[PDB]
């Protein structure tokens, strides 16, 4: 299903920034 692609793509861009907060 799309519903759960977008799901784990959402924490693909989610550790991305998350990043930028910490580096």
Same mark, same amino acid.
């Given at each position: =299903? +799309?519903? &759960? @692609? !977008? *799901? =784990?793509?959402? *924490? &693909? @861009? /989610?550790?991305? !920034? /998350?990043? *930028? +907060?910490?580096?």
């Amino acid at each position: =299903g +799309v519903v &759960d @692609i !977008l *799901k =784990g793509a959402a *924490k &693909d @861009i /989610a550790g991305h !920034l /998350a990043s *930028k +907060v910490m580096n």
